[PDB]
Amino acid sequence: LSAEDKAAVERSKMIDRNLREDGEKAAREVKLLLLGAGESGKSTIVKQMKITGIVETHFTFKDLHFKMFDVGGQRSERKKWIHCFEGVTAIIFCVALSDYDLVNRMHESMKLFDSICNNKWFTDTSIILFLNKKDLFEEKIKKSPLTICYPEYAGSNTYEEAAAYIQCQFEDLNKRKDTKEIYTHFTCATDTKNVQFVFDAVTDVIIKNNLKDCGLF
């Protein structure tokens, strides 16, 4: 009975301890999943923050560690591997705002957003909608009316109303408004507040998760 098997059991205990330690260490990083249409702004986004199938991007801010996976180079049935990613802390959806005229493209991006938002696996995951290229939207709205992309729209052909209308168009595609929250932001080149916005949204999500775990819903 257990002559030198004791050495085997000791080895088992040691590597079990190492497993537990590595798991506890990796359960304090926050994971973000970066969708987005075809090179809409996804390349631009990773520049502002500190900085083959998928590529991670580890970065830190205010003593918090973010990992951010993008899957743009994975051409396959998204249904067959999207379930790997359930349990990410948040989705970052990136939308180019100057694409309402080039080709319709906005309609396709809204279709993708609707497909991702209401998936059977992301029924609770919060998403952050980033809207890029607001600068070009200035001198693209001057000549081409937004009615080109939204024929049922009646309002001033100015930036202030157009941006709010587009944000409202996107923000009401979620069929479950009582469980998931959608954060929105108009990107700004300088004034590195983008990462600040991400930080705020992620902190609220952590608060909700802790409230769930403590038993207060």
Partner 1 sequence: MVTAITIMALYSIVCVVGLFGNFLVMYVIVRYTKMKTATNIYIFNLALADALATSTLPFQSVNYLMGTWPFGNILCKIVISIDYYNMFTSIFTLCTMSVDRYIAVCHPVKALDFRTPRNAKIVNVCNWILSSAIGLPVMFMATTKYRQGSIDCTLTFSHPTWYWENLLKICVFIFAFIMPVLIITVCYGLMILRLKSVRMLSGSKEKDRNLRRITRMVLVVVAVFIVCWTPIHIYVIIKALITIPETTFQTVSWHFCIALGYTNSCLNPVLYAFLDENFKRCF
Partner 2 sequence: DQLRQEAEQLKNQIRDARKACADATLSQITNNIDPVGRIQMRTRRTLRGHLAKIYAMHWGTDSRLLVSASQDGKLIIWDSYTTNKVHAIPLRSSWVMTCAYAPSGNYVACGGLDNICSIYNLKTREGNVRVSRELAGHTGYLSCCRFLDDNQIVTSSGDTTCALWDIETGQQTTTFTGHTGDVMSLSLAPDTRLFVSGACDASAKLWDVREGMCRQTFTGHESDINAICFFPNGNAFATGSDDATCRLFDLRADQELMTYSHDNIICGITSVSFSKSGRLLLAGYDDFNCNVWDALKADRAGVLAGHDNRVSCLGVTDDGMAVATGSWDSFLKIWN
Binding residues: 39-44, 70-74, 132-135, 189
Beta strand 90-96 with 126-132 is parallel
**What CA–CA distance (Å, rounded) separates 204 from 209?**
9
* Closer residue to partner 1 in complex, CB, 110/173: 173
190 binds, among partner 2, partner 1, none (CB under 5 to 8 A by kind): none
Under 8 Å between Cβ of 186 and 134: yes
Burial 191-215 (b: 16+ CB within 10 A, else e): eeebeebbbebbeebeeeeeeeeee
Q: Which residues are known binding-site members for GTP?
A: 39-44, 70-74, 132-135, 189
Residue whose entry in the numeric block shows the structure tokens 């009316």: 145
Beta strand 30-34 with 64-70 is parallel
Q: Does 4 bind partner 2 (CB under 8 A)?
A: no
Q: Does 18 bind partner 2 (CB under 8 A)?
A: yes
Q: Does 11 bind partner 2 (CB under 8 A)?
A: yes
Q: Closest Cα to residue 62, out of 192, 196, 188?
A: 196
**Range in contact with partner 2 (rule: CB under 8 A) among 13-21, 95-103, 163-171, 183-191:** 13-21
Q: Does 9 bind partner 2 (CB under 8 A)?
A: yes
18 binds, among partner 1, partner 2, none (CB under 5 to 8 A by kind): partner 2
Residues that bind partner 2 (CB under 8 A): 5, 8-9, 11-12, 15-16, 18-19, 22-23, 26, 52-54, 74-77, 80-81, 84
